[PDB]
Structures are given as structure tokens and as C-alpha cells.
């Protein structure tokens, strides 16, 4: 392939900034590179073709440039509906390749995760497999580490975490690390803890239930 390397994996901008997404080909592709916007769940909308030619109807926010092996999408004066994921695309020919993507996100302050831990109900212990969920509520930015330590040293694997999108109102979001075990191994231990590591708080926080008592 020609391999398109879209540089900002993501980035946080405030409404009004001049974001600069950049895409780079692994060889010269002349002027055949499209630029696309994608809202989630919606079909991608074509933004710029050639390397600077702007599709009819697209706002003049949008300024594409670059030649040969190096390109740039520039969005000055950023409105709110400008917030989405953007994909460069080289249309030299088959196989047409795409950019990895750049998610332009809302920048708002810093929040620390409100941490909660939830033990399994006897309902769920009855079925042989339990799920202990650790919750990271309403924090910003995204980067957050979540260890599980059971009951003294940490558990590796078995923990699928899942994250929401920036909440419509406050533009923070929440992570959900879910530790799953056999009911037999769940009963074989006592203290269950989830240690969280995030920037907006001066040292890691841990929540636990001893369950050798409840």
C-alpha cells in the first residue's frame, strides 16, 4: 500500500481555536487526497478533494493544503458542530487507503474521577461467574489507569474497561473497569480493590470491599 499516517491521534481544542490535523503518505501521491468528517453513527461527509479544493456546501472553516507526500487540514474558527473525527484518504487508485483518524475533542478544565467499587450480588454469585465493576465518574481528560489488586497483589487480565463519550452537558466522561472471575475464586479471596491513576488528583485512589465481611 501507500500508507497514510494521520498524525494527531486525538486532540482537545476549545471553540474558536485553529486546529491543524495533518496526514502523511509513505510516498508521493500527487494531489489526490480527500478529507472527510465523520460524526458518530452517521455517514462520513466529504470535506475537501484534490488537496485544497473544497466540496460545495462545506463551510470555508476548512482549509486543506500540502503536496506530494505531506498534507494538512486546517480548521480555523471552530464551531461546536465542527467536533468530530476526520479522515484523510488517498485516491491514487486501488487499493484506496485511509488515514488512522483524528478525533477533535472539547477542552474543558480538569476533573478527577469519582471512584466507586461494586461487589457482586448473591444473584450473580449463584451463576458461577461474578463481575466486580470499578467506576470512574465524570472526569477529564481520558487517560486513566485502573489496577485491580486482589487481595494484596494485583490481578492481570480478566478486566475489560469501557468508556463513554464526553457528556453533552459537562464534556467529562466515565470509565468502567469490570473484573470477572469464577464464583469459586471470588469466594477464595477477601479484600478486593481497584486502584485508579489519573492526572487530576495528587495520588492514586483505592476503593475496596472486604467481603470476608459482607
Amino acid at each position: 500500500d501507500i500508507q497514510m499516517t494521520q498524525s494527531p491521534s486525538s486532540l482537545s481544542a476549545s471553540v474558536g481555536d485553529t486546529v491543524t490535523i495533518t496526514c502523511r503518505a509513505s510516498q508521493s501521491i500527487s494531489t489526490w487526497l480527500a478529507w472527510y468528517q465523520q460524526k458518530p453513527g452517521k455517514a462520513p461527509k466529504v470535506l475537501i478533494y484534490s488537496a485544497s479544493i473544497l466540496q460545495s456546501g462545506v463551510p470555508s472553516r476548512f482549509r486543506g493544503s500540502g503536496s506530494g507526500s505531506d498534507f494538512t487540514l486546517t480548521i480555523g474558527s471552530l464551531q461546536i458542530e465542527d467536533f468530530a473525527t476526520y479522515f484523510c484518504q488517498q485516491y491514487t487508485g486501488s487499493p484506496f487507503t485511509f488515514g488512522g483518524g483524528t478525533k477533535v475533542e472539547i477542552k474543558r478544565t480538569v476533573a478527577a474521577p469519582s471512584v466507586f467499587i461494586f461487589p457482586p450480588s448473591e444473584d450473580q454469585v449463584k451463576s458461577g461467574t461474578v463481575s466486580v465493576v470499578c467506576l470512574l465518574n465524570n472526569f477529564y481528560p481520558r487517560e486513566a489507569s485502573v489496577k485491580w489488586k486482589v487481595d494484596g497483589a494485583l490481578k492481570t487480565g480478566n478486566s475489560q474497561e469501557s468508556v463513554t463519550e464526553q457528556d453533552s452537558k459537562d464534556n467529562t466522561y466515565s470509565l468502567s473497569s469490570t473484573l470477572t472471575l469464577s464464583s469459586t475464586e471470588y469466594q477464595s479471596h477477601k479484600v478486593y480493590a481497584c486502584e485508579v491513576t489519573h492526572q487530576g488528583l495528587s495520588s492514586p485512589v483505592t476503593k475496596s470491599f472486604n467481603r470476608g465481611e459482607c
Partner: protein
């Protein structure tokens, strides 16, 4: 303007051929110098173009990553064009787009995408549609020190993904976070809806999540209360 509208099964069993069909509106697929493409996007990844038919004659250009498995055609009268991804595995789970390449006029063989259909997430597994099990999530002791507490319930083991959760029949809409579904190794999904609540209102206000599942007609309402220490109660 032009409408591309795609249909097809949102679930495909392992090794089965994955069929999808895009219907064109406001344009003839016959009209010369357009390419009828098929693109797929894994969750949170970059789009992948996989193939396309030429408009005038049945000319097919294929992503070499998949030539052995894909076959793309155009229906000349019904004004449709289909996709056939053979022998699917779990790596073929993605959102599948049908889109149209027109021709960049500053160039000769240059074909850029200009129109897309909204997209069809199709997920590959072997399960039959299955109602979910819902387990309450609540603190095992009243967190008195924090003026606001967090509740929730775990939606676990269910198939095709449309599961919707509400709280107190739709009155509690504030502070509710409902995380994305995740296929576990079993081939069934798992969410959790959570709500933050003033801790003072625990024993006096009751809290219930309302899990619906259309492809199995499963409506369950689970009540969330502070955990006991052996078994709880009703």
C-alpha cells in the same frame, strides 16, 4: 440529492457469507464514470476500502487484502449494488459502508468518494438472540462520608446489541451513564448503567433500572438497594 440506502443482516455466523445491499436513489448506477464502493470501519479505527464496481460495465476492483473473499456486483435494473464477503471471522466485525466514487477532474484515473450511506454495523458470532440477565450494582455499606453515592445494574449475556436502559421509568435522567456494549469471550454482550444520586436520598427514595431488549421481548425491572452481607431481600 443522491441517496444510498443499505440493508442486510446485522449478524453473520462464522464462515458464512456476509451479504449487504446498497440501493441508489436520485442517480442511475448505469451512468458512466462512477464507482460503487464498499468500505468497512472497525470500532474506533480507520476506514478500510475493500472493493467497488464500475458504473457502465461490471468491472470490479478489489482490495488485495481480501480479493479471495469479496465479490461485488451491480444490479442494472433494480439500481442496486451488493457485497458478498465470504467466510467471515471475528475480524470482519465492523460498520460496513456503501459509498460512491466520482472522478476528480484535475486528473484522469482519480476517483474520490463523495456520497456515503449511513452505515450498517454487522457483528460476527454464532449466538441466537438471547435475553439479558440484570444484576443490581450498589454499595455494600452506605457511603455516608460522600454526600452523593453511585448505583447501577449490570446488563449481561444478551445478543443482538439493541438494549436500552432507563431509570425510574424515565424520570431519573440526570447523572445516568450507560456504557457501550462489549462482546465478551462468550459471544454475548455486557453493559452497565450507572447513576449518581444524593447519598441522603438512599433509604427514602427507591431506584430501579429498566432494561429493554427488542430482539427477545425481554423487559425486566431490577431494584437497587444497599447490599446486605449474606443474602438480601425483597
Amino acid at each position: 440529492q443522491v441517496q444510498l440506502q443499505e440493508s442486510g443482516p446485522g449478524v453473520v455466523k462464522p464462515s458464512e457469507t456476509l451479504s449487504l445491499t446498497c440501493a441508489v436513489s436520485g442517480d442511475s448506477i448505469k451512468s458512466a464514470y462512477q464507482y460503487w464502493n464498499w468500505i468497512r470501519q472497525p470500532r474506533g479505527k480507520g476506514p478500510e476500502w475493500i472493493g467497488g464496481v464500475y458504473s457502465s460495465s461490471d468491472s470490479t476492483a478489489y482490495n488485495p487484502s481480501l480479493e479471495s473473499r469479496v465479490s461485488i456486483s451491480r444490479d442494472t435494473s433494480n439500481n442496486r449494488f451488493s457485497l458478498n464477503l465470504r467466510s467471515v471471522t471475528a475480524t470482519d466485525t465492523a460498520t460496513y459502508f456503501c459509498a460512491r466514487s466520482v472522478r476528480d477532474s484535475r486528473g484522469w484515473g482519480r476517483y474520490f468518494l463523495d456520497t456515503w450511506g449511513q452505515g450498517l454495523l454487522v457483528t460476527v458470532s454464532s449466538a441466537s438472540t438471547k435475553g439479558p440477565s440484570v444484576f443490581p450494582l450498589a454499595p455494600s455499606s452506605r457511603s455516608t462520608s460522600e454526600s452523593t453515592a453511585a448505583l447501577g445494574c449490570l446488563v449481561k449475556d444478551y445478543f443482538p446489541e439493541p438494549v436500552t436502559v432507563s431509570w425510574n421509568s424515565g424520570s431519573l435522567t440526570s447523572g445516568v451513564h450507560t456504557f457501550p456494549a462489549v462482546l465478551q469471550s462468550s459471544g454475548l454482550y455486557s453493559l452497565s448503567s450507572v447513576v449518581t444520586v444524593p447519598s441522603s436520598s438512599l433509604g427514602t427514595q427507591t431506584y430501579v433500572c429498566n432494561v429493554n431488549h427488542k430482539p427477545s421481548n425481554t423487559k425486566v425491572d431490577k431494584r437497587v438497594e444497599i447490599k446486605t452481607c449474606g443474602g438480601l431481600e425483597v
